[PDB]
Design a protein around this nucleic acid. Structure first.
Lengths: 176, 176
DNA sequence: CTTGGTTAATAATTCACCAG
DNA sequence: GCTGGTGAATTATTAACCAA
C-alpha cells in the first residue's frame, strides 16, 4: 500500500502529468475548458464519468465548462488531472466503476438521419450496413482507423442500437 | 380504518370527482394534457408533486403531457383524479380561507417585471427589492384569478425578499 | 452586508426494453 | 420485423446557501 501509494507517484507518466496539469493551471481557465469539453466531445464521454472520478459537483462542472463559471484552483486542478490521465487511458485503449451508457455521436447521427428519409423499418441487414458505416466514421473522429473500432468500447455501435434508434425514431416523429 | 377507507370513497364531493375524471377519460387525451399542463402552469405546480402523489414515471408524464405520448388508461385515470383533487385542494386553501416540501418557482409574471426592474438597477436595496415582493406577489394572484389579499395562498411559490434577493444575484452572477 | 464558490433539485431528453 | 407502453440515466438549468 503506501509503497504503491508511492510506486504510483513516481513513473515518468506520473511526472509528465503532474506538470502538464500544472500549466493548465497557469494558463486561462477557459481556454482550457474548451479543450476539454472539446475532448470529451470528440470521444463522447459522459459528463458523469468525470464527476464520478473527480468528485466535483456536477452542476459546478457543467457550467464552468459550458459557461465558464469560475472554479477554484484546487478543483480545476482535479479536473485537469482527470483529463490528462484519461488521455492515456484512452490512448492505450487503442494504439495498444458503473459501466457507461452508449451515446450516438453526431457523426453517426448525420448518416443516420440521411439514411432515413422514408426508412421506416430497415431490413435487419440494411441496419448492419450502417452499423459498420457509423463506427467507420466514429473512428474518423477520434483520429484512428477503422481497423479497430473496439476501442470505441462503451460507445461502440451495434445492431440493436440503430435498431432502437429507428424505432425510437419512428415514435419521436409519431407525435406533437 | 376500512371505515375510513369507505367513508372516504363515499362523499358528495368525492363521488362527483370520480365522475369528472371518468368523463375526462373519454375525451381526447391530449385535450386534457393540454388542460392540465395548463392548469399546472397557472398555479405553477412542480412536475414532481404529480409524480409522487400519482406515482407515474416522471419521464412518461413529461411526455404524455408535453409531446402528448399516449399513456395507458389506468395511469391517466390516475392523473385526472389527481388533477381533479388538486383542484379542491388548491382552492380550499385559497379561495375562501385565512414526505417533502415543495420548492419555490418564479412565474413569468413575477419574472417579467423582474427583468424590467433589472436593466434598471443592478443592486436593489432592501427597500427596493421589498417593493417588488409586493408587485410579483400581486401579479401571481392575478394569474390564478384571486385577490391580492392573501396572496398568502400562493404558499410555496410565495415571493419574498431574500427570494427576490437571490434573484438578482443569480442574475448578476450570470453575466459572466 | 455583497460577491464568489458550490450546491441539491427539477425535468427535458436520451437510450434501452419487455410484454403482447 | 417483434411495437406500443414505460422506464433509468443523463445533464442543462434553477433557486438557494455558506464562507470570508
Amino acid at each position: 500500500s503506501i509503497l504503491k501509494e508511492l510506486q504510483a507517484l513516481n513513473t515518468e507518466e506520473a511526472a509528465e502529468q503532474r506538470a502538464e496539469v500544472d500549466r493548465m493551471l497557469s494558463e486561462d481557465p477557459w481556454r482550457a475548458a474548451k479543450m476539454i469539453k472539446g475532448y470529451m466531445q470528440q470521444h463522447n464521454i459522459p459528463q458523469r464519468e468525470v464527476v464520478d472520478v473527480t468528485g466535483l459537483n456536477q452542476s459546478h462542472l457543467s457550467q464552468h465548462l459550458n459557461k465558464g463559471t469560475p472554479m477554484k484552483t484546487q478543483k480545476r486542478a482535479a479536473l485537469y488531472t482527470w483529463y490528462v490521465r484519461k488521455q492515456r487511458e484512452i490512448l492505450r485503449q487503442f494504439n495498444q466503476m458503473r459501466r457507461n451508457r452508449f451515446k450516438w455521436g453526431p457523426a453517426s447521427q448525420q448518416i443516420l438521419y440521411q439514411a432515413y428519409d422514408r426508412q421506416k423499418n430497415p431490413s435487419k441487414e440494411e441496419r448492419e450496413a450502417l452499423v459498420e458505416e457509423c463506427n467507420r466514421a466514429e473512428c474518423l473522429q477520434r483520429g484512428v482507423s477503422p481497423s479497430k473500432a473496439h476501442g470505441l468500447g462503451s460507445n461502440l455501435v451495434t445492431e440493436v442500437r440503430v435498431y432502437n434508434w429507428f424505432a425510437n425514431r419512428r415514435k419521436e416523429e409519431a407525435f406533437r
